[PDB]
Design a protein around this ligand. Structure first.
Ligand SMILES: OC[C@H]1O[C@@H](O[C@H]2[C@H](O)[C@@H](O)[C@H](O)O[C@@H]2CO)[C@H](O)[C@@H](O)[C@H]1O
Length: 622
């Protein structure tokens, strides 16, 4: 990332902290630093973490360290925010989870006295407490300089707020999800927490306070079992709770009622992010925040790619999303270093990341100035803004008719293309092409193997288009140049690598009829088409039903089940203008322009507007 730089701020086996025991304080070298949380309190940067004094092993001696800086991270002061009980050589305060409100740092930690096993394996709660400490940040301008100070109060146990029973089950322990939590728009302090029951299942809840931390409540709902280390933000009046699932894809939920109800975010972010290339390795803590960049509300998300496997968790990656498009900003860590946990802060229009580096299970936290990354982010955000503005600004055929909708518009294939790719105007997922000739606002295809392939599950580890398994609208303009020998494809969602098994699609045949394909149902040819005429094609799928529209009108027989109510589809890719498979004997001679993908089923007016504005939406002229 050109322009970016970093320092080893919390340096393993080197950085010292003020270790207090029985009224005596000694500057003490720390073996490992883990669990970064990086925040802004009134212009003061504060970096909170675990100081694992003797080893990186989880069940060992740990205090919560804080560093703070008034100069954007050039210099820092160092404190212990929270000390462990000092009961034993493995006493520890763990998983520090931070909320900023006003001048206050709320830090929630589990506290353990003597156990040498990880908390989820405990059969009881005898070794556990849950503590809240408050740090009060003040600033001084005495002497013509800015000086900050943080006064940490004594921790208070919140155990009294943990019910012995929850929706049936009996509770054992809970911890914060680590990293940075939030103040909701209603002022509530909101911690996503990870909780165990007596069956040793782990699940996520919302733990919240309506009275500045004095009392706490749990929402009655929960994630699925197996969801740990939850991280949350508030988006459009809802909490978005992004969870770690060891050995599986991350589950993401939305709750509008402080955790009383949880709905999997299948239409947006759930199941997008895999913990390793084959999504069969441990997960991670993640930074997940909502921020406003160049006037646009967006979300930033970090997770390692974990090519190495196990808990090594190399290749920390950064992602940008507006809850519609999902852009890979790139790799924050360096080379193949192990770099699991992280915390991203956007402050005074500068981007920073405090994150782990691990060699031989000795961990430092580096403090990175993400200059290259913010440059890419602003570029991408300007492209999103530009194209949304382009589409929204179009005076559609009436005065002007209804505006073309950009709500839920995820991808758009128009004029830009290279020799082997059709480029997404939204810059997230290009389509691969074969036997494609560039024409205004699209591509012309010919010959066996021709077409374009827009990957869905084929995206691999990180599946930005997973939403399509639940609902989508796929729109294009198509022109047929040659009468085919038999039924030939134009547009569709494939369930397998070849395109032979379809969820929903549209073909055309030698008798000048359309052949809409509804899942595995026998195909009934219908309607009529003419060579050389530009047709508007809309495929919609929602609530397991698929519809095919030509020139804004449903084909006779549209609105059929395409998904057996038991299973959830796993779309491989969308195919456009052919299958893009030389193993498929069809030869589609067609031009396709302006392909739009939405994460929802468009309504009647929206479809009609798109049909009527086909000649106006191309990116060529702009
Ligand atoms: O490697 C650091 C990492 O260890 C994880 O714990 C693993 C451990 O790595 C593995 O050797 C052992 O067999 O199983 C453990 C989990 O039961 C921790 O989860 C993680 O926090 C790190 O401490």
């Amino acid at each position: 990332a050109p322009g970016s730089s970093r320092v080893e701020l919390f340096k393993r086996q080197s950085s010292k902290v003020p270790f207090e025991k029985d009224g005596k304080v000694t500057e003490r070298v720390v073996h490992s630093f883990r669990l970064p949380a990086l925040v802004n309190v009134d212009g003061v940067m504060v970096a909170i973490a675990d100081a694992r004094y003797e080893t990186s092993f989880d069940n060992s001696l740990i205090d919560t360290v804080a560093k703070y800086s008034v100069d954007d991270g050039e210099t820092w002061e160092t404190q212990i925010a929270i000390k462990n009980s000092r009961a034993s050589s493995v006493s520890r305060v763990v998983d520090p989870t931070v909320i900023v409100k006003g001048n206050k740092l709320y830090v929630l930690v589990g506290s353990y006295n003597s156990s040498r096993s990880y908390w989820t394996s405990h059969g009881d709660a005898r070794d556990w407490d849950i503590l809240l400490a408050v740090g009060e940040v003040t600033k001084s301008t005495a002497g013509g300089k800015i000086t900050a100070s943080i006064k940490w109060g004594s921790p208070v146990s919140l155990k009294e707020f943990f019910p012995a029973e929850m929706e049936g089950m009996h509770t054992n322990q809970f911890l914060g999800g680590a990293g940075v939590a939030i103040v909701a728009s209603n002022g509530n302090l909101v911690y996503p927490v990870q909780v165990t029951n007596k069956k040793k299942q782990v699940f996520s809840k919302i733990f919240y306070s309506e009275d500045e931390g004095k009392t706490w409540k749990f929402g009655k709902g929960r994630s699925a079992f197996g969801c740990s280390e939850p991280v949350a933000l508030e988006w459009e009046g809802k909490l978005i709770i992004n969870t770690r699932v060891d050995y599986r894809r991350r589950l993401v939920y939305e709750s509008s009622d402080m955790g009383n109800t949880w709905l999997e975010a299948v239409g947006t972010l759930s199941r997008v992010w895999g913990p390793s290339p084959k999504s069969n390795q441990p997960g991670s803590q993640s930074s997940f925040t909502a921020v406003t960049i160049e006037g646009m509300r967006v979300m930033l998300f970090t997770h390692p790619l974990n090519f190495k496997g196990r808990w090594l968790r190399d290749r920390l990656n950064l992602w940008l999303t507006d809850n519609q498009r999902i852009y890979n900003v790139g790799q924050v860590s360096i080379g193949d270093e192990n770099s699991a946990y992280s915390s991203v802060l956007y402050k005074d229009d500068k981007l920073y990341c405090l994150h782990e580096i691990n060699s031989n299970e000795v961990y430092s936290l580096v403090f990175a100035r993400l200059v290259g990354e913010l440059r890419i982010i602003k570029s991408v955000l300007q492209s999103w803004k530009n194209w949304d503005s382009h589409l929204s600004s179009i005076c559609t055929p009436a005065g002007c008719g209804p505006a073309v909708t950009t709500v839920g518009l995820v991808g758009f294939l128009s004029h830009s293309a290279t020799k082997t790719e059709w480029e997404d105007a939204y810059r997230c997922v290009n389509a691969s092409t074969a036997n494609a000739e560039r024409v205004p606002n699209g591509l012309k295809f010919a010959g066996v193997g021709g077409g374009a392939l827009w990957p869905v599950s084929q995206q691999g580890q990180n599946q930005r288009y997973h939403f399509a398994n639940h609902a989508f609208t796929l729109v294009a303009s198509v022109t047929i140049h040659e009468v085919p020998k038999g039924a030939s494809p134009l547009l569709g969602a494939s369930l397998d690598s070849s395109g032979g098994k379809k969820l929903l699609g549209l073909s055309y045949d030698k008798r000048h009829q359309w052949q809409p394909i509804y899942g595995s149902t026998p195909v009934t040819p219908t309607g009529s088409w003419e060579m050389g005429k530009r047709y508007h094609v809309v495929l919609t799928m929602a609530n397991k039903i698929g519809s095919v529209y030509i020139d804004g009108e449903p084909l006779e027989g549209s609105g059929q089940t395409v998904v057996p109510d038991e299973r959830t589809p796993d779309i491989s890719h969308f195919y456009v203008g052919g299958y893009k498979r030389s193993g498929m004997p069809t030869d589609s001679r067609v031009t396709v322009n302006n392909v739009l993908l939405y994460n929802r089923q468009l309504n009647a007016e929206e479809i009609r507007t798109l049909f009527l504005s086909q000649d106006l939406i191309g990116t060529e002229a702009h």
